[PDB]
């Protein structure tokens, strides 16, 4: 849905109201999770002071996202280098102190609630307008002008056969993906197709640090360390 130059098409009528109904209910379940585990002694011992990573080594290891915010490093791409309209949205970034497995679990759960504040603002400050860049040489024209106007059809033909030819150049854009600092390195020769696309996966740098974390911990801890790391192997294996 999220395409270059804007989203594919506008939301259906009544979608935002359905968002509001769910967001009302959700905070009444996030605390419900916290009731189940956050104060549970068994969950605490299985997660407190376990898989602890310090500040400098985590920073040196190429970590990002929770691995940084969990150990005390107050870094978040949504705040430091805000992309899109993330600047016009107020929110807090939970920062841990111990840096262990447990502190990240609160960091993720607190990220839940902070996201709910972002959703509340996005619904309340939705602006009118189109959903894709007006430039038809970049985003395909709507089907209405497709079937009546010469230029729209020509552009739609070439866009879906050739595609927009981007200027030559290379860039690395990273965003605060829920796992971490997901980033892509796109090198373009100038034709209608990319020349090289390196995919900075937040879990790639993380998983290299599995050995550094699990030092002296038992195997059951390694199972715990895998979970907090929040790795999905589509991103790391690319």
């Amino acid at each position: 849905y999220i395409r270059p130059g804007g989203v594919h098409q506008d939301l259906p009528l009544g979608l935002l109201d359905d968002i509001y109904e769910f967001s009302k209910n959700f905070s009444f379940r996030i605390d419900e999770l916290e009731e189940m585990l956050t104060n549970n002694r068994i969950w605490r011992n299985r997660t407190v002071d376990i898989g602890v990573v310090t500040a400098e080594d985590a920073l040196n290891y190429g970590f990002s996202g929770v691995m940084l915010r969990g150990s005390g490093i107050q870094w978040d791409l949504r705040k430091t280098q805000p992309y899109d309209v993330y600047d016009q949205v107020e929110f807090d970034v939970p920062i841990g102190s111990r840096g262990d497995c447990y502190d990240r679990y609160l960091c993720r759960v607190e990220e839940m609630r902070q996201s709910l504040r972002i959703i509340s603002q996005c619904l309340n400050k939705m602006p009118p307008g189109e959903i894709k860049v007006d430039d038809a040489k970049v985003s395909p024209p709507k089907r209405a002008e497709m079937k009546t106007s010469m230029e729209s059809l020509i552009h739609h033909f070439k866009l879906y056969t050739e595609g927009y030819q981007v200027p030559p150049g290379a860039t690395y854009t990273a965003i605060e993906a829920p796992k971490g600092e997901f980033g892509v390195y796109l090198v373009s020769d100038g034709s209608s197709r990319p020349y090289r696309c390196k995919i900075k996966a937040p879990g790639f740098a993380h998983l290299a640090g599995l050995d550094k974390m699990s030092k002296g911990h038992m195997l059951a801890d390694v199972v715990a360390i895998i979970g907090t790391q929040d790795i999905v192997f589509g991103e790391v294996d690319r």
Partner: protein, 95 residues
């Protein structure tokens, strides 16, 4: 499928909160699945005059990467001014 009031108290008491105010199961509050036909807006450039592409394009306005030194006193300069330490939260300080 509405719970009997007898167990409405049971679920409320056993969890120490009012479940019936907001439940996970959806009900008639959802938006209707059939909606009137929408009229979508037009973009800012949908003007039938003074919309020349030469003053509107974005691709043809990218210059080649500007070169500042090639291998072919001055004050020390940081890449950007150092970040300002984030202030503590106001809505919710220390948890």
């Amino acid at each position: 499928a509405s719970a009997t009031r007898v167990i409405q108290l049971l679920r409320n008491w056993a969890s120490g909160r009012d479940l019936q105010a907001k439940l996970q199961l959806r009900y008639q509050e959802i938006s209707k699945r059939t909606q009137p036909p929408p009229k979508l807006p037009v973009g800012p450039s949908h003007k039938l005059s003074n919309n020349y592409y030469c003053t509107r394009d974005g691709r043809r306005e990218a210059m080649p990467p500007s070169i500042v030194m090639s291998s072919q006193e001055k004050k020390a300069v940081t890449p950007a001014p150092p970040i300002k330490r984030w202030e503590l939260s106001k809505d919710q300080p220390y948890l």
